[PDB]
Design an enzyme around this catalytic site. Sequence first.
Site, PDB file in Angstrom:
ATOM      1  N   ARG A  39      39.812 -28.533  10.683  1.00  0.00           N
ATOM      2  CA  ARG A  39      41.191 -28.533  11.098  1.00  0.00           C
ATOM      3  C   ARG A  39      41.458 -29.660  12.075  1.00  0.00           C
ATOM      4  NH1 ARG A  39      40.590 -21.973  11.203  1.00  0.00           N
ATOM      5  NH2 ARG A  39      39.236 -22.686  12.962  1.00  0.00           N
ATOM      6  N   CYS A  89      55.604 -45.797  16.064  1.00  0.00           N
ATOM      7  CA  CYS A  89      56.581 -44.765  15.696  1.00  0.00           C
ATOM      8  C   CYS A  89      55.952 -43.746  14.780  1.00  0.00           C
ATOM      9  CB  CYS A  89      57.810 -45.370  15.048  1.00  0.00           C
ATOM     10  SG  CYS A  89      57.292 -46.760  14.170  1.00  0.00           S
ATOM     11  N   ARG A 139      57.608 -40.170  15.622  1.00  0.00           N
ATOM     12  CA  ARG A 139      58.389 -39.853  16.842  1.00  0.00           C
ATOM     13  C   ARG A 139      59.841 -40.363  16.788  1.00  0.00           C
ATOM     14  NH1 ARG A 139      59.713 -44.310  19.655  1.00  0.00           N
ATOM     15  NH2 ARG A 139      58.411 -46.151  19.184  1.00  0.00           N
ATOM     16  N   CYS A 169      62.585 -42.430  13.877  1.00  0.00           N
ATOM     17  CA  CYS A 169      62.728 -42.751  12.487  1.00  0.00           C
ATOM     18  C   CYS A 169      64.093 -43.368  12.199  1.00  0.00           C
ATOM     19  CB  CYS A 169      62.556 -41.486  11.652  1.00  0.00           C
ATOM     20  SG  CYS A 169      62.773 -41.821   9.883  1.00  0.00           S
ATOM     21  N   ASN A 199      57.955 -45.893   5.260  1.00  0.00           N
ATOM     22  CA  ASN A 199      56.981 -44.955   5.836  1.00  0.00           C
ATOM     23  C   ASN A 199      56.513 -43.918   4.815  1.00  0.00           C
ATOM     24  OD1 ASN A 199      58.911 -45.359   8.794  1.00  0.00           O
ATOM     25  ND2 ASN A 199      56.733 -45.978   8.629  1.00  0.00           N
ATOM     26  N   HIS A 225      67.267 -40.836  13.006  1.00  0.00           N
ATOM     27  CA  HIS A 225      68.588 -41.387  13.286  1.00  0.00           C
ATOM     28  C   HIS A 225      69.097 -42.384  12.226  1.00  0.00           C
ATOM     29  CE1 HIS A 225      65.426 -43.691  15.488  1.00  0.00           C
ATOM     30  NE2 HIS A 225      66.025 -44.713  14.904  1.00  0.00           N
TER      31      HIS A 225
HETATM   32  C1  LIG Z   1      58.835 -48.748   8.317  1.00  0.00           C
HETATM   33  C2  LIG Z   1      58.428 -49.859   8.460  1.00  0.00           C
HETATM   34  C3  LIG Z   1      57.868 -51.255   8.555  1.00  0.00           C
HETATM   35  N1  LIG Z   1      58.741 -52.164   9.281  1.00  0.00           N
HETATM   36  C4  LIG Z   1      58.456 -52.417  10.709  1.00  0.00           C
HETATM   37  C5  LIG Z   1      59.688 -52.113  11.579  1.00  0.00           C
HETATM   38  C6  LIG Z   1      59.800 -52.701  12.842  1.00  0.00           C
HETATM   39  C7  LIG Z   1      60.930 -52.466  13.613  1.00  0.00           C
HETATM   40  C8  LIG Z   1      61.977 -51.650  13.157  1.00  0.00           C
HETATM   41  N2  LIG Z   1      63.088 -51.446  13.950  1.00  0.00           N
HETATM   42  C9  LIG Z   1      64.131 -50.670  13.512  1.00  0.00           C
HETATM   43  N3  LIG Z   1      65.185 -50.526  14.300  1.00  0.00           N
HETATM   44  N4  LIG Z   1      64.068 -50.031  12.276  1.00  0.00           N
HETATM   45  C10 LIG Z   1      62.953 -50.208  11.464  1.00  0.00           C
HETATM   46  O1  LIG Z   1      62.787 -49.425  10.522  1.00  0.00           O
HETATM   47  C11 LIG Z   1      61.889 -51.035  11.900  1.00  0.00           C
HETATM   48  C12 LIG Z   1      60.754 -51.275  11.132  1.00  0.00           C
HETATM   49  C13 LIG Z   1      59.872 -52.734   8.592  1.00  0.00           C
HETATM   50  C14 LIG Z   1      60.740 -53.631   9.230  1.00  0.00           C
HETATM   51  C15 LIG Z   1      61.838 -54.197   8.577  1.00  0.00           C
HETATM   52  C16 LIG Z   1      62.078 -53.878   7.245  1.00  0.00           C
HETATM   53  C17 LIG Z   1      63.251 -54.484   6.515  1.00  0.00           C
HETATM   54  O2  LIG Z   1      64.099 -55.250   7.178  1.00  0.00           O
HETATM   55  N5  LIG Z   1      63.385 -54.220   5.221  1.00  0.00           N
HETATM   56  C18 LIG Z   1      64.484 -54.718   4.416  1.00  0.00           C
HETATM   57  C19 LIG Z   1      64.195 -56.070   3.744  1.00  0.00           C
HETATM   58  C20 LIG Z   1      62.823 -56.138   3.095  1.00  0.00           C
HETATM   59  C21 LIG Z   1      62.523 -57.543   2.609  1.00  0.00           C
HETATM   60  O3  LIG Z   1      63.021 -57.927   1.517  1.00  0.00           O
HETATM   61  O4  LIG Z   1      61.766 -58.322   3.257  1.00  0.00           O
HETATM   62  C22 LIG Z   1      64.845 -53.669   3.388  1.00  0.00           C
HETATM   63  O5  LIG Z   1      65.953 -53.818   2.799  1.00  0.00           O
HETATM   64  O6  LIG Z   1      64.068 -52.683   3.118  1.00  0.00           O
HETATM   65  C23 LIG Z   1      61.224 -52.982   6.599  1.00  0.00           C
HETATM   66  C24 LIG Z   1      60.122 -52.418   7.266  1.00  0.00           C
HETATM   67  C1  LIG Z   2      57.564 -49.476  13.057  1.00  0.00           C
HETATM   68  C2  LIG Z   2      58.680 -48.541  12.695  1.00  0.00           C
HETATM   69  C3  LIG Z   2      59.895 -48.495  13.358  1.00  0.00           C
HETATM   70  N1  LIG Z   2      60.854 -47.604  12.967  1.00  0.00           N
HETATM   71  C4  LIG Z   2      62.132 -47.601  13.661  1.00  0.00           C
HETATM   72  C5  LIG Z   2      62.368 -46.318  14.474  1.00  0.00           C
HETATM   73  C6  LIG Z   2      63.305 -46.849  15.553  1.00  0.00           C
HETATM   74  O1  LIG Z   2      64.647 -46.926  15.033  1.00  0.00           O
HETATM   75  C7  LIG Z   2      62.750 -48.253  15.831  1.00  0.00           C
HETATM   76  C8  LIG Z   2      61.703 -48.252  16.956  1.00  0.00           C
HETATM   77  O2  LIG Z   2      62.371 -48.185  18.213  1.00  0.00           O
HETATM   78  P1  LIG Z   2      61.992 -47.163  19.398  1.00  0.00           P
HETATM   79  O3  LIG Z   2      60.634 -47.502  19.889  1.00  0.00           O
HETATM   80  O4  LIG Z   2      63.015 -47.357  20.485  1.00  0.00           O
HETATM   81  O5  LIG Z   2      61.956 -45.806  18.770  1.00  0.00           O
HETATM   82  O6  LIG Z   2      62.116 -48.678  14.613  1.00  0.00           O
HETATM   83  C9  LIG Z   2      60.637 -46.729  11.872  1.00  0.00           C
HETATM   84  O7  LIG Z   2      61.526 -45.924  11.511  1.00  0.00           O
HETATM   85  N2  LIG Z   2      59.454 -46.739  11.234  1.00  0.00           N
HETATM   86  C10 LIG Z   2      58.478 -47.588  11.580  1.00  0.00           C
HETATM   87  O8  LIG Z   2      57.377 -47.575  10.986  1.00  0.00           O
HETATM   88  C1  LIG Z   3      43.491 -23.497  22.238  1.00  0.00           C
HETATM   89  C2  LIG Z   3      44.138 -22.916  21.015  1.00  0.00           C
HETATM   90  C3  LIG Z   3      43.441 -22.518  19.887  1.00  0.00           C
HETATM   91  N1  LIG Z   3      44.113 -22.008  18.812  1.00  0.00           N
HETATM   92  C4  LIG Z   3      43.352 -21.567  17.655  1.00  0.00           C
HETATM   93  C5  LIG Z   3      43.593 -22.439  16.413  1.00  0.00           C
HETATM   94  C6  LIG Z   3      42.272 -22.238  15.678  1.00  0.00           C
HETATM   95  O1  LIG Z   3      42.300 -20.985  14.968  1.00  0.00           O
HETATM   96  C7  LIG Z   3      41.247 -22.192  16.821  1.00  0.00           C
HETATM   97  C8  LIG Z   3      40.678 -23.581  17.147  1.00  0.00           C
HETATM   98  O2  LIG Z   3      39.692 -23.921  16.175  1.00  0.00           O
HETATM   99  P1  LIG Z   3      39.627 -25.325  15.390  1.00  0.00           P
HETATM  100  O3  LIG Z   3      39.343 -26.397  16.375  1.00  0.00           O
HETATM  101  O4  LIG Z   3      38.509 -25.212  14.388  1.00  0.00           O
HETATM  102  O5  LIG Z   3      40.994 -25.538  14.822  1.00  0.00           O
HETATM  103  O6  LIG Z   3      41.956 -21.703  17.971  1.00  0.00           O
HETATM  104  C9  LIG Z   3      45.523 -21.857  18.836  1.00  0.00           C
HETATM  105  O7  LIG Z   3      46.131 -21.376  17.851  1.00  0.00           O
HETATM  106  N2  LIG Z   3      46.220 -22.264  19.910  1.00  0.00           N
HETATM  107  C10 LIG Z   3      45.612 -22.777  20.988  1.00  0.00           C
HETATM  108  O8  LIG Z   3      46.276 -23.165  21.974  1.00  0.00           O
END
Ligand SMILES: C#CCN(Cc1ccc2[nH]c(N)nc(=O)c2c1)c1ccc(C(=O)N[C@@H](CCC(=O)O)C(=O)O)cc1
Ligand SMILES: Cc1cn([C@H]2C[C@H](O)[C@@H](COP(=O)(O)O)O2)c(=O)[nH]c1=O
Ligand SMILES: Cc1cn([C@H]2C[C@H](O)[C@@H](COP(=O)(O)O)O2)c(=O)[nH]c1=O
Lengths: 264, 264
Positions: B126, B146, B166, B168, B177, B207
């Site tokens: 697990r 992210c 975290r 999107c 992704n 978002h």
């Molecule tokens: C997830 C992830 C990886 N990443 C990394 C990455 C870094 C910063 C970001 N920042 C923000 N605000 N959003 C994103 O999703 C994001 C993604 C990507 C970044 C850009 C594109 C992009 O502009 N795609 C366009 C054009 C693609 C092309 O033709 O080159 C598209 O239309 O899809 C795709 C993925």
């Molecule tokens: C690298 C990456 C960024 N992002 C987007 C999420 C956010 O809009 C932005 C990152 O900005 P943040 O760090 O302020 O969250 O890029 C994705 O959705 N997927 C990805 O893999």
């Molecule tokens: C510490 C802790 C363990 N557990 C349980 C999950 C598993 O059944 C077991 C941990 O074993 P595992 O490392 O093999 O997953 O303990 C919780 O559900 N919550 C907790 O906070």
Amino acid sequence: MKQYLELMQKVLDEGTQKNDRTGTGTLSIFGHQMRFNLQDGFPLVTTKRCHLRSIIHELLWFLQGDTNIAYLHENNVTIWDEWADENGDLGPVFGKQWRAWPTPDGRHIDQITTVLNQLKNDPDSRRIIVSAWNVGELDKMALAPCHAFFQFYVADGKLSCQLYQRSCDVFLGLPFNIASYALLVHMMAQQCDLEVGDFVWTGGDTHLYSNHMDQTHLQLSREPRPLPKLIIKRKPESIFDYRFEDFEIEGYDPHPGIKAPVAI
Amino acid sequence: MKQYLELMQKVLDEGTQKNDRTGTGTLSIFGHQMRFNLQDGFPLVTTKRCHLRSIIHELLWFLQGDTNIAYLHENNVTIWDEWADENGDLGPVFGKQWRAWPTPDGRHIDQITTVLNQLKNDPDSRRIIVSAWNVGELDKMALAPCHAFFQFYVADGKLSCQLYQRSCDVFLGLPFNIASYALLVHMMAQQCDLEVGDFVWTGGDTHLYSNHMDQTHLQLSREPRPLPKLIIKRKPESIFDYRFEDFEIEGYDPHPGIKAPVAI
Ligand SMILES: C#CCN(Cc1ccc2[nH]c(N)nc(=O)c2c1)c1ccc(C(=O)N[C@@H](CCC(=O)O)C(=O)O)cc1
Ligand SMILES: Cc1cn([C@H]2C[C@H](O)[C@@H](COP(=O)(O)O)O2)c(=O)[nH]c1=O
Ligand SMILES: Cc1cn([C@H]2C[C@H](O)[C@@H](COP(=O)(O)O)O2)c(=O)[nH]c1=O
Ligand SMILES: C#CCN(Cc1ccc2[nH]c(N)nc(=O)c2c1)c1ccc(C(=O)N[C@@H](CCC(=O)O)C(=O)O)cc1
């Protein structure tokens, strides 16, 4: 609670038999999410009596950065006894990673203080995260962190939190985990002057142990009671200065407790 | 795809206006989960044309442990240009944490090799986890990871994977992704002789950017097409020896591509 019994039943209906680390056997599903609106009440399960003393002290213990069980013993909390060594140590588990994550260059990062700073200065941030999953110290931990990673989010004056839990004992562990994180959200919101929003729980391997089946069937026959309300009586100077006595759980009227063995 | 357009609409209907790091503004929800059964087809969005070349090369790049964009440029992939410094570096982002997470005591842990060992020797575990969220190196990263944390799970001969993301960008980032992690699950399953199970996606701050609204309305008017099928033509000696040419996406017949600006 409704969301909680629905999960129990889902695991019984859809879980596949899986062997496990402990040699006990489980019914297991992978990937589940539920949401608790904290304004609706404090999410403490009512279809069995939960030991609040253990729940509250375990959290205060995480927040001190302590990983030795002496503090728990001083307060008659025995939930961590099985995994501690002869000196009462667990290794650099939760509290240590939360308060003093060690870096390669010799620093220690206090993630809880960082979060408080982010909440106070950059509440729209999408990076308000605490992780216990320190890859470089896993080999020293008595048990790898099951509640491994969580994120705060602020919108419209309310604090939300999502927990990723990689492994979840639905019967024994989960009621504690839900209440534990709901408590931390209430503490954090008080310290930051925000209202409470949602607690979102996300599970990886979500399971019932094979020797919890009678207990599960018993609990599922019970009707949930109204949720209790959490009252915090004092606003301490900091998140690290809460005491057991500061919390009051009002209107908690659970069904009887149900004994079940823990898988070691 | 059905799950994907349902999310788009949910964000439009239930999202609250939130300021963001980039100064663009978003509609945002917190906490969402969807599941893709990989046996149903390869989850590549069809209501707009996705650039598979960028998707595949970015993953091969993560797996090499590379964090400099030169490899991407050599292959005419420009998706990471905005965040790289003058030397083309991003700092110890994804690939570095996956392949060589640095420890306090001077070691480097290859998380991908560890996972392969766990899948081959302890599939019921697990704790089959990869994390990019290295607290001690966040300050050196061009952008905090992210897609931060993922877990594998095996039951009934099938490999499942859950990603915690975290933050999107639903319009631009999410289609990449989903396909990126679905690809890795197919590669890992081939290497371990397992069948593909589910890809479970979990989001924190999910978002739509305010300057993607026209594009979102356009895409939501389109009917999804049948999913394509992923064919891997060769079984390389290891997970690190895949080439762009080894993958064939059969029956991909998307609606036209939709241009949208990225928020920097
Ligand atoms: C997830 C992830 C990886 N990443 C990394 C990455 C870094 C910063 C970001 N920042 C923000 N605000 N959003 C994103 O999703 C994001 C993604 C990507 C970044 C850009 C594109 C992009 O502009 N795609 C366009 C054009 C693609 C092309 O033709 O080159 C598209 O239309 O899809 C795709 C993925
Ligand atoms: C690298 C990456 C960024 N992002 C987007 C999420 C956010 O809009 C932005 C990152 O900005 P943040 O760090 O302020 O969250 O890029 C994705 O959705 N997927 C990805 O893999
Ligand atoms: C510490 C802790 C363990 N557990 C349980 C999950 C598993 O059944 C077991 C941990 O074993 P595992 O490392 O093999 O997953 O303990 C919780 O559900 N919550 C907790 O906070
Ligand atoms: C989550 C978490 C923290 N933890 C840590 C912890 C450590 C290992 C585990 N191992 C397994 N297999 N399941 C668990 O949930 C678990 C939990 C707990 C451990 C035990 C109890 C427990 O036995 N509770 C009983 C009795 C309580 C009492 O009166 O002392 C109960 O009936 O609730 C609760 C929490």
